[PDB]
């Protein structure tokens, strides 16, 4: 697992364009926010991602990049990304390598057997250390957007 | 690796609505067209499904049913189904059970490590026997739509 003191597990996932994205390596020096979401094309996940899209400027200010992660395939995540005018990166963890690594692998009672991510948020600092964690078993609850921003800002100052 | 004459491997996958669908048990009597496609939201698969969509009249009067199968999650496939006004059912082989059972598991040259279906078409008769087969590793080629229609007609007349 990932705990509030450990370096963030180094993972390599492909984005909606099929470009490899190395986390946290490719983001040394800047604060990164990993937003794990259950399934693309769902009310709550759409809302959550749209919310991050909208606050995109606030994040640019503090040199912070938000990355969405779901076990969905790249092609669907791409379609998902465009339809909601999302402009931060979205990567496909199709082998569940990330959900497992970050210990947020779960299952929807309604779709047993389908392994997906529990809506969670992880903020990694400029040095690749996890400094904030939030996980919800209930996929209807959204993150504490404000609390996240505050932490991103505080982390950006070090 | 199924072949002409064999009994269609029984598979149970959920549809865009999360309802289990069983093939070819649930369709004993009718002729079924299994349309395996690599991925939702891609030019060639979007074209191929659209083609079956537009010729659903011809199928429903020889009493045949077309079924879409991809390893995409039910959520994405749903959005995929609606956004293209698709009518026939589309099931999710999220655990590659059917692609393996039918021997059509593979990868897109464009994305190594992602196991998906090779675009392929299987035509099961009224008794559940595989009568027509077509597979293409090249994710670029489309099926022989008329050749499929001919076969479905001939098979319905038994
Ligand atoms: Cl969700
Ligand atoms: Cl495709």
TrEMBL record, chains A, B:
Top-level taxon in the UniProt lineage: Archaea
GO biological process, one term: cellular response to oxidative stress
Keywords for this protein: Oxidoreductase, Redox-active center
GO molecular function, one term: thioredoxin peroxidase activity
Xref: InterPro entries: AhpC/TSA (IPR000866), Peroxiredoxin_AhpC-typ (IPR024706), Thioredoxin-like_sf (IPR036249), Thioredoxin_domain (IPR013766), Tpx_Peroxidase_subfamily (IPR050455)
Keyword Ubl conjugation: no
Pfam families: AhpC-TSA
Record: active site: 45
Residue ranges occupied by any Thioredoxin domain in the UniProt entry: 2-156
Protein name, per record: Peroxiredoxin, bacterioferritin comigratory protein homolog (Bcp-4)
Gene for this chain: bcp-4
